Amino acid sequence: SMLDDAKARLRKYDIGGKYSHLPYNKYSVLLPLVAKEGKLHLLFTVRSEKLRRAPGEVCFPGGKRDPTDMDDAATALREAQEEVGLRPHQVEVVCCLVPCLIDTDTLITPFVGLIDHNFQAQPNPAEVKDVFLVPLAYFLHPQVHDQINHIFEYTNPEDGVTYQIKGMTANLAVLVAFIILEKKPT
Numbered sequence: 001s002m003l004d005d006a007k008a009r010l011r012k013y014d015i016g017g018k019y020s021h022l023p024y025n026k027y028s029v030l031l032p033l034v035a036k037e038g039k040l041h042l043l044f045t046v047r048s049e050k051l052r053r054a055p056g057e058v059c060f061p062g063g064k065r066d067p068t069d070m071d072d073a074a075t076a077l078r079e080a081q082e083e084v085g086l087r088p089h090q091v092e093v094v095c096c097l098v099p100c101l102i103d104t105d106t107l108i109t110p111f112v113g114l115i116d117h118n119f120q121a122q123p124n125p126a127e128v129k130d131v132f133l134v135p136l137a138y139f140l141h142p143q144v145h146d147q148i149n150h151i152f153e154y155t156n157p158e159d160g161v162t163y164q165i166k167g168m169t170a171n172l173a174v175l176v177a178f179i180i181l182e183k184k185p186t
């Protein structure tokens with residue numbers, strides 16, 4: 001099936017816990033895969049304008065590890081619950097992709113999660129200004145705009161609203177699209 005095929009692809013890139021004990025400032029992100037209308041989509045957040053780190057930006061759910069978290073996956077799931085109401089029975093964590101090194105002292109670990117068909121996002125306004133889906137295939141032929149560095153623009157056909165996606169967020173989206181959609185019969 002579509003979903004079994006995605007998970008089987010994703011598992012070949014799982015690095016597991018290999019880089020998780022290293023002495024960094026530690027953050028985790030959740031890459032949430034949603035199946036609608038026979039196709040896969042990624043779920044994104046728009047960060048609240050009130051926050052210290054990165055106000056108004058498009059990012060995946062995630063944040064800083066804390067002492068309650070049993071491991072890096074737990075951080076990602078805690079933070080997704082707090083931001084959009086995603087509960088643990090509603091997500092299957094399939095793998096851990098290559099981590100992102102930043103600022104010489106920080107390591108960000110991404111997890112890919114398959115989201116239950118009855119989940120419906122409840123944006124928490126203290127953290128998140130908006131929540132939106134993008135079809136995974138978009139990231140193979142994106143609408144690119146140079147600021148010199150590359151920015152993606154996605155317009156939702158439901159309502160005509162445009163979103164800008166950039167940096168590590170855009171990089172991870174492309175990676176997941178390649179892993180899952182490369183070399184497929186039609």
Ligand SMILES: CCOc1ccccc1N1CCNCC1
Nearest residue numbers: 027028029054057058059062063
């Ligand atoms: C989840 C941890 O996020 C960070 C941690 C450190 C620096 C930048 C970011 N982001 C993440 C993606 N959106 C921009 C800001």
